[PDB]
RNA sequence: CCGGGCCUUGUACACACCGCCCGUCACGCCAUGGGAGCGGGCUCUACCCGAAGUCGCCGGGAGCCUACGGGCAGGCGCCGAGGGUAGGGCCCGUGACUGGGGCGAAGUCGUAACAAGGUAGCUGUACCGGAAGGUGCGGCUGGAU
RNA sequence: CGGGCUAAUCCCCCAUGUGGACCCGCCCCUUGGGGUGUGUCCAAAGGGCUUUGCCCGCUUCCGGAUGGGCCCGCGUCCCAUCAGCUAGUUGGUGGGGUAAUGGCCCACCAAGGCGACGACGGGUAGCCGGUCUGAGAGGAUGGCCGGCCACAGGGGCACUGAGACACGGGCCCCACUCCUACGGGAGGCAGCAGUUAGGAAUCUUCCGCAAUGGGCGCAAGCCUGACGGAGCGACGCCGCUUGGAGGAAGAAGCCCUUCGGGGUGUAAACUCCUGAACCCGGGACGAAACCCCCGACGAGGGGACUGACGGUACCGGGGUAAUAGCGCCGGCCAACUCCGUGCCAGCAGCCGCGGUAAUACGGAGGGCGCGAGCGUUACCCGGAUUCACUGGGCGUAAAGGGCGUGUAGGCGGCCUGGGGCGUCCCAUGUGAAAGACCACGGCUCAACCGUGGGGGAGCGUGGGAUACGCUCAGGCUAGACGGUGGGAGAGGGUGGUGGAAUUCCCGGAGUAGCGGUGAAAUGCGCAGAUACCGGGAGGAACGCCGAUGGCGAAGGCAGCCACCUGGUCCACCCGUGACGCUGAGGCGCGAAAGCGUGGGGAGCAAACCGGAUUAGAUACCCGGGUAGUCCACGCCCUAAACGAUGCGCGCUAGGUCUCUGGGUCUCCUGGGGGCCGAAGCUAACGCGUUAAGCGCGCCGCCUGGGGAGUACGGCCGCAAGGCU
C-alpha cells in the first residue's frame, strides 16, 4: 500500500456513504493523532483502539445526520466531503500566510506541523503551516 | 497522467498556424494582378465572382477577390490586398482594397463606403 | 405478386429505398513528394601561400644613439584575418518527367458498404483484377435470424 | 624626405627615503592577509599673484569613496526526424603573461572530461526592471524610460593609456564608392536632421547653451545634435467646440398608408441669451548660483548679467452661431419598412442569405452605437476547462503499449532514537529608482509629473520546533519471498503410438450411369466409373467425452502413453523480517499469411483453366487445380493480438450457477469462471468485489475530420514490409 492516510480517509468516506455505525483501519500514532482532530471538530463520534485477529486497528465510530422525509430519507452526511491533499505523488507544503480556509469557514484542513496536527484555524492561531493532510466537510 | 510524467514530458503548448502566410507578418502587401477574371463558387451557390491573381513583393502569388460591383483591374494594375478569405471560393484567402493604387472604389455606392473606397458625394 | 394493421429487430436512410453511399477512367484549380540534374547558404577536415600585430632568437662582414654588459633600425621564427587546392555534412530553392492526394461537378462504367444491402461485415497478410473490390488462411462480433 | 637651432609641467642620471617594491628568515594569521629584520630599487615641477606667504599644481605611502575585472550556486526558447561529443580535449609539474585565478597561452607526464538531469548539431532571439492579457496560476512580450551586455561597413591586431584592443584613433586585408592634373589619393550616420533603396508605413537637412548634466580652466569663458524646446504625423491617451433657452397637436421636401393616417420632429425656420476663433493692451514662473564687494577666496550677509522656447501660455476689454463624419440593423447583437433585382450583379467572422413579396445585396426613408473620430487587416492574451499545477481525459465519441521480464527513475506498511536535508516560525541584509497599488499636492480638470506612505515571493546570514518526507541505527510481523503435505489442468517441449474417414494403387464381384446444383453444365463412365467386400501405401486432423468448462501474461493449447519442465491454488501457520509495487530504455514471446534451406504432399485450397448465373460476372454456386496449410532450423513481429477495459494494493449489500481446493460436510472458508442486481458512477447504451464505484502509486496514451499510418530522415529485414 502507498498512502494509508488517504486509505484511512478513503475507508471513512467509503462507509459514511453506506451509513456504517463504525469501521476499522490499521493503526498508527499518526492516523490516531489525525482522528483526534476529527471528533474534537465533530465529524466522527470518536475512535477506540480495537484489535483484530492479532493485529491493532482503530474502529472509528461514525456520526451522521437525521432521517428525512421526501423519497430519499437517508440521513445527510456530517462529512459531506473528505479528500486527500498533499500526497506521495505531490507533497504539498504551505506557509502560514498561504493556508486555505475550507469552504468559507465551514470545513477544515488537517495540517502536519512541528507543533502537532492542527486545523486550518489552529495553525493560523499558532502561526505556522506544514504538509496539508486533507480538507474535509 | 502522473505528476511525474507532467514533470518528465510536461504539456505541449500547441502554437497557431497563421492563415495569411503570403503576408510575412504584415497587414498589407502590394501586388500586381496577373489573371483578372471570374470564378464560380462551390455549392450551394451560383455566380461568377471577381477574382484577382497577384504577385507580391513577398515573392508569392495568390488569388485576391475583388469586392463590390464594377472595378478597373487588368494586367499590370498596381494593387493592395488584405487578410480575409471567401469561404465558398477555395483558392482565395485574401481581399483587395478598392480606392488604392491602380484600383478604384465602387461607383454610385453610398453605404459602407469605407469598405469600398468611395468618397463622399454632396 | 399488390395494399394496409399491430409487436419486435437492424439501420451509416430523415429529400426517408425514386434514400444513402464507394472506386477507376474524363475535365478544371491548387498543393506536397519522387526524379538524370542544375543553382545558392551554412559548416567540418587536411594542406600550400600568408598582410598588419603582439610575442620569442639574432643584432655579425654591418648603420645610428650612448643612457656602451644597452636602445632603435634591421634580419629569422611561431600564431595569424583571409585567399587558394581537394574532399565530406546539412538545409532552401529549381528541374524534363512521374506518383498519389484535396476541392470543384451538373459527365462515363458499374453498385462494394449502410436492411440478412441481396455472397453477413470488418480485420492482418497473400494473390488476382478496368475500378470500387473478389478470394485463400487464420482472427474479432462492431453479425441479422 | 632631409639637413641644422631652441623652451617647458616633455624625456634621462645622481643625491635625500617618511615611506613603498623583491628576495630569504621569523610571530600571528590561513590560499598570495598584517607586522618584523639585513642586502638591493625608486620620487618630483614648476606657474601665478598684491611677495619670507598665499593659491594651483608635481612626488610618493595608508585609507576612504565610486566605477570595475575575474569565479561560484540556482533559473533562462524550439526540434531526439540531432544520441553520442571531445587532442587544448579533462588533470598535473614547470614557465609566460595580466592588475589578478585560469587550458588564457607553450613544453612535457597521465588518460582522462560531457551526456536521456538531454551532451553534440540545427532553428530562433539581445536578457532584467517591466509591458499587455488574465478572477487567478498562467500565457505573450522585452520599443519607448532605467540597468547590464555585445557591435561601430564585413574580419584580424596591438600601440596610447588610470582605464579600450577604442564609432566620429591608428596598422594591414577584403568588399564598395568617389576624387584626380591619370603620376596617384580618400571615405565609412547603428551620433542630429537629411537623401536613395527596399516597405503596408514611421518626422525637421529648425533655436539655442537660458536650465540640468558633462569636459577643460582659478576664474572669466569654451565645446557641447547630451540636454531644453519648435515643427510634421489622429500614431495612443486626456481635455474642448460645432451652440444654449423658448419654440405648433406639428411648414416644405422626403419615406410608409388600410388613403382616415403615419414617420422624420423640437429638428428647422424665427425671438432672446451666451460668445470658438479672429482684433488690441498687458505679459510671466522657470533664474540663483558661478563671479564681483566686507569678512578670511571659507560660515554668513549684500551686489548685478543673463530666457532658446516667446511676445507663447496665461491676465484684461471687446467680439462672430461657429465642422460631422463612420459602423452597424437575418441570430449571435441594440436598431424596420418601401422600391430595384430575380442562384444574375452581390454581402460573408462563423451558421448561412438570392431561384418575382429578400427585416441578410443596392439605394432611400427611418433607426442603433460611438463620436474627430469610425471601421477593416495583421499579431498577442481572453473567451479555450481546447496541453486541464489550480484544472480534462482514455469499454462504444480521438486515446491502454500484443504480451511478458527487467535497468534507471518515481513511489513506498507498524514502533522506538539520533541528525535536521526538504518543511515551518522569528529576526536581518539585499530585492536601485521609474512603473503598478492607497493617500494627498501643481498645470483652471484630466492625460501627464511631483511627495509620502504601505507588502511580497526568491535567494545570503543566525536561532528554533520535529508531525509528515528523507537519512543513520534498533526492534516487529499485517505486503512479498520461503518450508511440510497435497490437488486439479487441451500450460510448454522431445520421443513413441491408436482408431474412424477422405484420396490413389492392386484383387474379387457387378451394370447404365455417377457426381453436382435453386435448376443445369463442365467434368468422370462400356478403355467398365459410381455403391460393395478384401489387402496395401501416405498425409493431416483427433469424433462422443466436451460443456455458460479448464490452463496460459499473451498469441494460443484438445486421441493415448512416458520423460523433461513452468506457472498456480489450499491447508499448517514452521523460517527470512519491508526484502515492496511500477517500470522510459533493453531483452524475450508473439495466431494466420509470407520469406529461406531441406523434407513432405491424402484432404482442402489463393492465383489459373473450365462450366454456369447474369446486360456483363476477371466474382457469390459447380468441376479441376499450383504454391501454401504439415515436420526441422532460421527469419518475418503485424491484427477486430478485444474485455476495443495497463499492473499491484486497500475500502464499498447481496442473490443464483459453475471449476477446483479446505473443512464440521446442514453449511462455513480460499482462488478462478458467468449471470442480476445495493448504494455510487456514466452523455446514454451500460458497468457494479473480475468495476467502468471511493482512493494511493507508477507506465503508456489522446488533443477535430481527411490528407495518412503517407512523405522525409533513421533503425530493423533476404524480400514483401515493420517500428518511429
Ligand atoms: Mg493540489
Ligand atoms: Mg445559392
Ligand atoms: Mg513588385
Ligand atoms: Mg493600367
Ligand atoms: Mg482576417
Ligand atoms: Mg459602414
Ligand atoms: Mg406487403
Ligand atoms: Mg390493431
Ligand atoms: Mg420493422
Ligand atoms: Mg433497389
Ligand atoms: Mg485529375
Ligand atoms: Mg519537387
Ligand atoms: Mg548542390
Ligand atoms: Mg599545399
Ligand atoms: Mg605559416
Ligand atoms: Mg623588430
Ligand atoms: Mg589557418
Ligand atoms: Mg581557412
Ligand atoms: Mg589574401
Ligand atoms: Mg460485399
Ligand atoms: Mg449491394
Ligand atoms: Mg452484403
Ligand atoms: Mg484477407
Ligand atoms: Mg495490373
Ligand atoms: Mg477473384
Ligand atoms: Mg473464415
Ligand atoms: Mg485470439
Ligand atoms: Mg472481439
Ligand atoms: Mg450489426
Ligand atoms: Mg634647453
Ligand atoms: Mg633612483
Ligand atoms: Mg587591463
Ligand atoms: Mg585553450
Ligand atoms: Mg600519452
Ligand atoms: Mg543534470
Ligand atoms: Mg526535451
Ligand atoms: Mg522575446
Ligand atoms: Mg516590438
Ligand atoms: Mg534599454
Ligand atoms: Mg563587428
Ligand atoms: Mg570594425
Ligand atoms: Mg553601415
Ligand atoms: Mg572596418
Ligand atoms: Mg576604430
Ligand atoms: Mg567595446
Ligand atoms: Mg560614424
Ligand atoms: Mg540618419
Ligand atoms: Mg517605394
Ligand atoms: Mg523628433
Ligand atoms: Mg550649456
Ligand atoms: Mg554648466
Ligand atoms: Mg582670476
Ligand atoms: Mg578668447
Ligand atoms: Mg564643435
Ligand atoms: Mg536622448
Ligand atoms: Mg433648439
Ligand atoms: Mg498682444
Ligand atoms: Mg521666471
Ligand atoms: Mg474674452
Ligand atoms: Mg444656426
Ligand atoms: Mg461597428
Ligand atoms: Mg446586416
Ligand atoms: Mg428572416
Ligand atoms: Mg456590440
Ligand atoms: Mg433584435
Ligand atoms: Mg454590408
Ligand atoms: Mg447549418
Ligand atoms: Mg422583394
Ligand atoms: Mg476626443
Ligand atoms: Mg485566439
Ligand atoms: Mg466571457
Ligand atoms: Mg482559464
Ligand atoms: Mg475532456
Ligand atoms: Mg475508435
Ligand atoms: Mg491489452
Ligand atoms: Mg529499482
Ligand atoms: Mg514511511
Ligand atoms: Mg526517523
Ligand atoms: Mg531541516
Ligand atoms: Mg520599487
Ligand atoms: Mg487638483
Ligand atoms: Mg511614486
Ligand atoms: Mg500585492
Ligand atoms: Mg522577504
Ligand atoms: Mg534560514
Ligand atoms: Mg527524528
Ligand atoms: Mg526515496
Ligand atoms: Mg530497518
Ligand atoms: Mg500474511
Ligand atoms: Mg507463501
Ligand atoms: Mg491431387
Ligand atoms: Mg476394381
Ligand atoms: Mg475399399
Ligand atoms: Mg463439441
Ligand atoms: Mg471458454
Ligand atoms: Mg512464526
Ligand atoms: Mg526474529
Ligand atoms: Mg514487472
Ligand atoms: Mg511469428
Ligand atoms: Mg504459421
Ligand atoms: Mg521460395
Ligand atoms: Mg529466392
Ligand atoms: Mg519446398
Ligand atoms: Mg497437389
Ligand atoms: Mg473451388
Ligand atoms: Mg466481357
Ligand atoms: Mg461467360
Ligand atoms: Mg471463374
Ligand atoms: Mg477440389
Ligand atoms: Mg516457395
Ligand atoms: Mg509467392
Ligand atoms: Mg508457409
Ligand atoms: Mg515454405
Ligand atoms: Mg511490439
Ligand atoms: Mg472473444
Ligand atoms: Mg482477461
Ligand atoms: Mg488497440
Ligand atoms: Mg486508470
Ligand atoms: Mg470438497
Ligand atoms: Mg465467485
Ligand atoms: Mg450485470
Ligand atoms: Mg442505483
Ligand atoms: Mg469520475
Ligand atoms: Mg479475477
Ligand atoms: Mg504497463
Ligand atoms: Mg487538420
Ligand atoms: Mg490530423
Ligand atoms: Mg500497417
Ligand atoms: Mg523511407
Ligand atoms: Mg511503414
Swiss-Prot record, chain A:
PROSITE patterns: RIBOSOMAL_S8. SUPFAM superfamilies: Ribosomal protein S8. Keywords: Ribonucleoprotein, Ribosomal protein, RNA-binding, rRNA-binding. InterPro entries: Ribosomal_uS8, Ribosomal_uS8_CS, Ribosomal_uS8_sf. GO terms for cellular component: ribonucleoprotein complex; ribosome. One of its GO terms (molecular function) is rRNA binding. One of its GO terms (biological process) is translation. It comes from the Bacteria. The keyword Transferase does not apply. The keyword Mitochondrion does not apply. Part of the 30S ribosomal subunit. Contacts proteins S2, S5 and S12. Belongs to the universal ribosomal protein uS8 family. One of the primary rRNA binding proteins, it binds directly to 16S rRNA where it helps nucleate assembly of the platform of the 30S subunit central domain. The combined cluster of proteins S8, S12 and S17 appears to hold together the shoulder and platform of the 30S subunit. This is Small ribosomal subunit protein uS8.
UniProtKB/Swiss-Prot annotation, chain B:
It comes from Thermus thermophilus (strain ATCC 27634 / DSM 579 / HB8). This is Small ribosomal subunit protein uS12. One of its GO terms (molecular function) is rRNA binding. With S4 and S5 plays an important role in translational accuracy. SUPFAM superfamilies: Nucleic acid-binding proteins. Part of the 30S ribosomal subunit. Contacts proteins S8 and S17. Interacts with IF1 in the 30S initiation complex. PANTHER family: 30S RIBOSOMAL PROTEIN S12 FAMILY MEMBER. Residues 108-119 have a biased composition (Basic residues). HAMAP family: Ribosomal_uS12_B (MF_00403_B).
Amino acid at each position: 500500500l502507498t498512502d494509508p492516510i488517504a486509505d484511512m480517509l478513503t475507508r471513512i468516506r467509503n462507509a459514511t456513504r453506506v451509513y456504517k455505525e463504525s469501521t476499522d483501519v490499521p493503526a498508527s500514532r499518526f492516523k490516531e493523532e489525525i482522528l483526534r482532530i476529527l471528533a474534537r471538530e465533530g465529524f466522527i463520534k470518536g475512535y477506540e483502539r480495537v484489535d483484530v485477529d492479532g493485529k491493532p486497528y482503530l474502529r472509528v465510530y461514525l456520526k451522521y445526520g437525521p432521517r428525512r422525509q421526501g423519497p430519499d430519507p437517508r440521513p445527510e452526511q456530517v462529512i459531506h466531503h473528505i479528500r486527500r491533499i498533499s500526497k506521495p505523488g505531490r507533497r504539498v507544503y504551505v506557509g502560514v500566510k498561504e493556508i486555505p480556509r475550507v469552504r468559507r469557514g465551514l470545513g477544515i484542513a488537517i495540517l502536519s506541523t512541528s507543533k502537532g496536527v492542527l486545523t486550518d484555524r489552529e495553525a493560523r492561531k499558532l502561526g505556522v503551516g506544514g504538509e496539508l493532510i486533507c480538507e474535509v466537510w | 497522467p502522473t505528476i511525474n510524467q507532467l514533470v518528465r514530458k510536461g504539456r505541449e503548448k500547441v502554437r497557431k498556424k497563421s492563415k495569411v502566410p503570403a503576408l510575412k507578418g504584415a497587414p498589407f502587401r502590394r501586388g500586381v494582378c496577373t489573371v483578372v477574371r471570374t470564378v464560380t463558387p462551390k455549392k450551394p451557390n451560383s455566380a461568377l465572382r471577381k477574382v484577382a491573381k497577384v504577385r507580391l513583393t513577398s515573392g508569392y502569388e495568390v488569388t485576391a477577390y475583388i469586392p463590390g460591383e464594377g472595378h478597373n483591374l487588368q494586367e499590370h494594375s498596381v494593387v493592395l490586398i488584405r487578410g480575409g478569405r471567401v469561404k465558398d471560393l477555395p483558392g482565395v484567402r485574401y481581399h483587395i482594397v478598392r480606392g488604392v493604387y491602380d484600383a478604384a472604389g465602387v461607383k454610385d455606392r453610398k453605404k459602407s463606403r469605407s469598405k469600398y473606397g468611395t468618397k463622399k458625394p454632396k
